[PDB]
Structures are given as structure tokens and as C-alpha cells.
Amino acid sequence: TQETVQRILLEPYKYLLQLPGKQVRTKLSQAFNHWLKVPEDKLQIIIEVTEMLHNASLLIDDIEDNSKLRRGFPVAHSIYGIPSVINSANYVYFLGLEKVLTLDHQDAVKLFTRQLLELHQGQGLDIYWRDNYTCPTEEEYKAMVLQKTGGLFGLAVGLMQLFSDYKEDLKPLLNTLGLFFQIRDDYANLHSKNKSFCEDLTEGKFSFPTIHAIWSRPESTQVQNILRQRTENIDIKKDCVHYLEDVGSFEYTRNTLKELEAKAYKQIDARGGNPELVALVKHLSKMFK
Amino acid sequence: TQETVQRILLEPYKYLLQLPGKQVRTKLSQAFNHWLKVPEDKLQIIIEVTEMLHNASLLIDDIEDNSKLRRGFPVAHSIYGIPSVINSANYVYFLGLEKVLTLDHQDAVKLFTRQLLELHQGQGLDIYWRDNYTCPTEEEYKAMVLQKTGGLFGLAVGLMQLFSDYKEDLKPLLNTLGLFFQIRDDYANLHSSFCEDLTEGKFSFPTIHAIWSRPESTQVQNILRQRTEYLEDVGSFEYTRNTLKELEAKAYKQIDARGGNPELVALVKHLSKMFK
């Protein structure tokens, strides 16, 4: 009956849509429309595509990170099982490709193909580093973030620019915003004090503050011992936070974010200014200010 | 030095490739070019896409069925972990789409999307029945197989048809070959345990016959899910053997209806020795 089969195939995806989300990709797309001025018919398809693909990748991320909860609620594969979530999220990917084909543009699929290939390289490296106990350098981590986060950012803005007269190069600004967002999340996860606490330590992932501490003081192995343990001991995680403070990694992260915030303002002005985008950067910058 | 990233991302996929296995999709697609006469440069790209999608779907299936072994060796996620295999397989999916774009044909991506959506609908039904222990009927299983297995055969011949003037209908033969190859794999895995797959809810052609050969009022189970609502007294393996014997004969008549194809006939006859 087709409508029946699509219903059971989208069930894990529909569960995730009800969970609390931030929709930052929507808020960044609307800010970039200040320049691009994309007609509303194409713009809605673009936004649906982007959030479709972003929501499907969250389903996959939670499996790949062994997450237990998502925003306070049980994770999707805890309820529907790993096999259903994989097939559902993967099915959504190709529903997104099907929707991209409705934009009626020869370059749209090429963009889709490139950006999804970028996101899988980013996510793959991040997984590989964690699963093979290989701590990346700061440069390597930044290069990976540009792919993992720049993937969907670049898909949205790139597709918009296909239907815009504004042809200026927005890729440097997008790279700054990709780093800014990811490192700000790394900082919040650890520098924060019901609510989850340092779940990146429990997930054993190398984040920006832990990477700095590892290479800053290689004589010590404290952070490695905690990440390898992949434990949920609150006290062990608290001791990791105390270490990153004395080593000065939280300050290093704040200075990195402040420098990124300043580059974003300089890059936004070069592109002609964008009060919506500027206001958004400032509001997110208070966290480390 | 940046191509190392690509080697890392394809480690689980390359492990399954190295595993000794028949390349039916390749020889089948080469035998179909006896009719379609695709230029060899385009045929090679089509073959690569097909085997890419095939081996990537195998990495995912083994997770989705909790398989322990493939081609006699441990499953890739038992070596590289489930996270790496999911990413690797999905990466190959979009490397396959990128390779399709090199065919330089406006209709290729539309065909790629349609078949990929068909495959995930077949794989999703297979998972749903297994999770709810609602064994499918023979009819339901065969409809599911024509998507989960024909979807890939249909991509290969469909793309070949984009570069050919041959306009004869090959869909009946493809449906026959798809059912044939699937039931043959079902027979081989269970022939040289029944209770294991049954206890675990793994539904295949021989076990489907075992369930529905008796009263089998599995409507209590079907009333618990979005589902709703096997003849002569013979063994399940023998029923599978007769079904396969019928499919081989149907394939021969359909090949003869298309003027003949000695390589295709030889491929079927060779694969048919499994149940004879």
C-alpha cells in the first residue's frame, strides 16, 4: 500500500523529529539569505533537504558514538533497534536526493554528492581516531571539523547560491563558522557544570580542549586514561575537568573562539555586512566571554 | 598523503572485497551485454557502481541481521566495529553516486535514486518482519525480494539500457533471475540450522515453507503490528528445490524468447548445480 511501507520505514526518523532541536542550519540559512535573496519556493525545498539530511545523520551519529540519550530522551535505536534506525536514516538520505532533483538544476546533484562525501570523510576520521586510540593534532582536528560540519552548511548555502545573483565567494566565512560552532560545542560539553555531564569523555571522543591538553603536556597521560576508560564515573570526569583547567586548555579554547569570532566579523564585512549573521555570532560568543 | 584518508574510510569495504566470492552481478551484466551492446568504457563504470553498491549493502545487511560470518570469515563489524562499517558502507554509497555522474546522462541519477529507494524499502520490510516475528507469506517474501535483490539487478540493466538501442523488455527475465538467485542463497545457507533461524526470527524461503505448511495461525502476531491477515505435503528443502527447478526452467524459456544468450544460459546452468 506504499503509504504503509513508508510509514514503518520512517518511524525512527519521526521519533527524532519530536525530540528537542536547535535548527541552527535553518537559522544560518536564513541569515545567509540576506546576501543570496533566494526565491521562497526554492528556499523551502533547500531548507527541508538540509534538515532532512541533518536529522538522518543524528540517528547515525548516536549509533556511531554509543550515545544513551538525546536531549534527555532515550535514543532512537534504544526503542526501535539498530537495524531499523540504520535503514531509516539511510532511506532518508535518498529521499533527500530525490527532493534535490526537484530543484531542477544540473549542478544541484553534483553539490549534493560532494558535500555528502565530505561529511562522511569527516565522520569517518572522527570515528577512526577514537576507535584506534590515535589522538589527532590540532591542525588535523580542524581539518576534520571543516568536513564534518562544513558538509551540511556548504550544502545549504551552495544550493541557495545556485538560485541567486550573489556570486561572491562565501566559502571562507563558512569555514570560520564551522570551526566556531564545533569548538564552541566542545567547550560547552566540558566547561559546563538531570542534565548530562561531559558525555564526550564518556564517548571517548577527542574534542578541542582535550586535544590541547594532550599535546601541551605529553609527559602526562591523565586525559588519555580517562578517554580510554569510556566510563560514566562522574568523579573521574570531574577530575578531567579540573585537569584541563590547570593545564589552561579551557582558556586556550576561549582564546581560539575569540579569534574565530573576530575573523567572522572581518569576513562578514568583506562580503558586504549582514546584521542578522553578526547578531547571531555575538549571541553565541557570550558563552566564552 | 591525503589519499590515506580514503584508504582509512574504505578499510571495512576493502576487507569484504578481498573475501573470495563469486561476482554474479559482473558476469550477469557481461552476459546481458550480448543483447545491449554497451560500449566497454560505459559498461566498466556500470559494473563498478553495481559491485560497489552490492558489497556496501552486504556490510549493512550483516549488521541488520546480526550475522556472525560472511564468505566463511568473520563479519566486518566484528573486526572494525559497527561505527566504522556504517560510515564505510554509506561512504561507498555516495562514491557510487559520484561514479554514476561520470556516465554523463541526464536520466542516470533518476534511475539511481529510484533503485536505491526500492532497495531500502525491501530491506526495511525484511527488518520489520524479523523484529516482530511476523513471518511473511511466500507472496510477501517474493515481492520483498524483487526490491531488495532486483533493485540492484535493475540498476545495472537500467543503466546499460541508457546506452543501448535494444528495446526488448527484460523485466520478466530480471524478476525471474532475482527470485532465482535469492532462493538459491536461502537454500545454500540452510542446506549443506532450521531451529536457529526460526528461534531468532530469520525468515527465508525454506523456513517460510516450514511455518506456513501447518495450520500456522500467526494472526496473533500479525495483530500486534502494522501487518494484517505451502501446499502438497513435501519437505521444505525439497519444496525449495522444486521452486528453484521451476525458476531455472522459466529463465531458459525467457532467454529463448529473447533470441538466446549462451553466456547467460551457461551462468544459470552452472549456478543450478547447487540444487541438483
Task: Give one DSSP letter per residue of chain B, joined into a string.
Answer: --HHHHHHHTHHHHHHHHS----HHHHHHHHHHHHH---HHHHHHHHHHHHHHHHHHHHHHHHHTT--EETTEE-THHHH-HHHHHHHHHHHHHHHHHHHHTT--HHHHHHHHHHHHHHHHHHHHHHHHHHHT-PPPHHHHHHHHHHHTHHHHHHHHHHHHHT----S--HHHHHHHHHHHHHHHHHHHH---HHHHHHHT---HHHHHHHHTS---THHHHTTSS-----SS--HHHHHHHHHHHHHHHHHHHHHHTT--HHHHHHHHHHHGGG-
* Inter-chain touch A131–B82, beta carbons under 8 Å: no
d(CA B47, CA B103): 12
All residues of chain B having their beta carbon less than 8 Å from the beta carbon of residue A8 are: 124-125, 128, 226
Check A117 against B131: CB less than 8 A apart.
no
Using CA atoms of A97, A102, A104, A106 in order, give the dihedral in degrees to the nearest 10.
10
Tell me how far apart the alpha carbons of residues B74 and B78 are, in angstroms, rounded to a whole number: 6
Could you tell me which residues of chain A have a Cβ less than 8 Å from any Cβ in chain B?
4-9, 60, 63-65, 81-84, 86-88, 90-91, 93-95, 97-98, 101, 109-110, 113, 116-117, 120-121, 123-125, 127-128, 131
What gap in Å lies between CA A265 and CA B232, rounded to an integer?
A: 78
Q: Which of A91, A113, A127 sits opposite B124 (nearest CB)?
A: A91
DSSP tag of A81: -
Q: Can you tell me the distance from the alpha carbon of A213 to that of A223, in angstroms, rounded to the nearest whole number?
A: 8
Task: Select from B60, B91, B124 the Cβ nearest to the Cβ of A8.
Answer: B124
**Cα distance between residue B177 and residue A263, in whole Å:** 60
**Is B182 annotated as belonging to a binding site?**
yes
Q: Which residue has the cell 558535500?
A: A115
Other beta carbons within 10 angstroms of residue B245's beta carbon come to: 13
Instruction: Provide the CB-side half-sphere exposure for A46 (13 A, CA).
Output: 32
Q: B interface toward A at CB cutoff 8 Å?
A: 5, 8-9, 60, 63-65, 80-84, 86-88, 90-91, 93-95, 97-98, 101, 109-110, 113, 116-117, 120-121, 123-125, 127-128, 130-131, 226
User: Which residues, 6+ apart, have CB-to-CB distance to A208 below 8 Å?
Assistant: A138, A141, A182, A183, A186, A187, A253, A256
Task: Give the total residue count for chain B.
Answer: 276
SS3 A70: strand
| A101 to B86: CB separation less than 8 angstroms, yes or no | no
- Going by DSSP bridges, is the β-strand pair B69-70/B73-74 parallel, antiparallel, or unpaired? antiparallel
- Residue A176 is assigned to a ligand binding site: no
CA angle B207, B208, B213 (to 5 degrees): 100
Which experiment gave this structure? X-ray
**Of the candidates A204, A181, A205, A201, the residue with the CA atom closest to the CA atom of residue A192:** A201
Angle between helices A138-148 and A208-216 (to 10 degrees): 170
Considering CB atoms only, which of B90, B93, B113 is closest to A98?
B113
Nearest to A141 by CA among A209, A228, A65, A200: A209
Give the burial string for A4-13 (b: 16+ CB within 10 Å, else e): ebeebbbbbb
d(CA B240, CA B180): 10
Asked whether residue A131 is marked as a ligand-binding residue, the answer is no
Count of other CB atoms within 10 angstroms of residue B90: 24
> Grid cell 531488495 — which residue?
B148
Joined grid coordinates for residue A171: 566559502
Alpha-carbon distance of A245 to A231, in angstroms, equals: 20
Residue A74 near residue B59 (C-beta atoms within 8 A): no
Is B202 a known ligand-binding residue? yes
* Residue A178 distance to chain B (closest CA, Å): 20
Cell numbers that stand for A11 in this block:
518511524
Classify strands A69-70 and A73-74 as parallel, antiparallel or unpaired.
Answer: antiparallel
User: What is the amino acid identity at position A138?
Assistant: E
Torsion, Cα of B25, B27, B31, B33 (10° steps): 70
Nearest-Cα residue of chain B relative to residue A88: B124
> Would you say the C-alpha torsion A256, A51, B60, B106 has a positive or negative sign?
negative
Task: With beta carbons less than 8 A apart as the criterion, state whether A92 and A53 touch.
Answer: yes
Question: To which residue does cell 547515525 refer?
Answer: A60
C-alpha Rg value of chain A to the nearest Å: 20
Other C-beta atoms lying within 10 Å of the C-beta of residue A255: 12
> How far is residue B41 from each of residues A236, B34, B47, B92, measured CA to CA in Å?
59, 15, 10, 21
Query: Collapsing DSSP states into helix, strand and coil, what is residue A154?
Result: helix
Any idea which residue has 549493502 for its cell? B57
Nearest to A148 by CA among A85, A61, A89, A249: A61
Query: Any known ligand binding at A70?
Result: yes
The rounded Cα A208 to chain-centroid distance in angstroms is 14
Four-residue CA torsion sign, A148, A150, A152, A158: negative
Angle between helices B138-148 and B106-132 (to 10 degrees): 140
Residue in A109, A115, A116, A119 to test binding to B, most B beta-carbons within 10 Å: A109
Q: Is A271 annotated as a binding residue?
A: no
CB contact under 8 A, A93 and B88: no
Three-state SS at A22: coil
Q: Among B189, B180, B194, B184, which Cα is nearest to B236's?
A: B194
**CB–CB of A204/A130 below 8 Å?**
yes
Question: Who contacts A238 (Cβ-Cβ below 8 Å, separation ≥6)?
Answer: none
Q: Which three cell numbers stand for residue B175?
A: 524478476
- Cell representation of residue A103: 530543484
Q: Are B177 and B253 contacting, i.e. CB atoms less than 8 angstroms apart? A: no
Across the interface, do B97 and A84 touch by the CB < 8 Å criterion?
Answer: no
With CB atoms and an 8 Å threshold, state whether B113 touches A101: yes
Q: Label residue A170 exposed, middle or buried (CB < 10 Å: 0-12, 13-18, 19+).
A: buried
Beta-strand ranges (E) seen in chain A are: 69-70, 73-74
- What structural domains and CATH numbers belong to chain A? 1-162 (1.10.600.10), 168-289 (1.10.600.10)
Burial of A134: CB neighbours in 10 Å, binned 0-12, 13-18, 19+:
exposed
Hey, what's the cell of B146?
524483487
Q: How many CB atoms lie within 10 A of CB B215?
A: 6
Calpha distance B225→A4 (Å, rounded): 12
- A162 half-sphere exposure, CB direction, 13 A CA radius: 21
**A102 to chain B nearest CA, in Å?**
11
**Could you tell me the CA-to-CA distances from A103 to A26, A151, A154, A160 in Å, in that order?**
18, 19, 16, 10
Q: Is B262:B256 a contact under the CB 8 Å cutoff?
A: no
Residue B78's alpha-carbon distances to A3, A70, B62, B74, in angstroms, are: 36, 26, 10, 6
In angstroms, rounded to a whole number, what is the distance separating the alpha carbons of residues A208 and B202?
44
Which among A171, A159, A177 has a CA at the least distance from the CA of A33? A159
DSSP SS3 for A252: helix
- What letter does residue A69 receive in the DSSP assignment? E
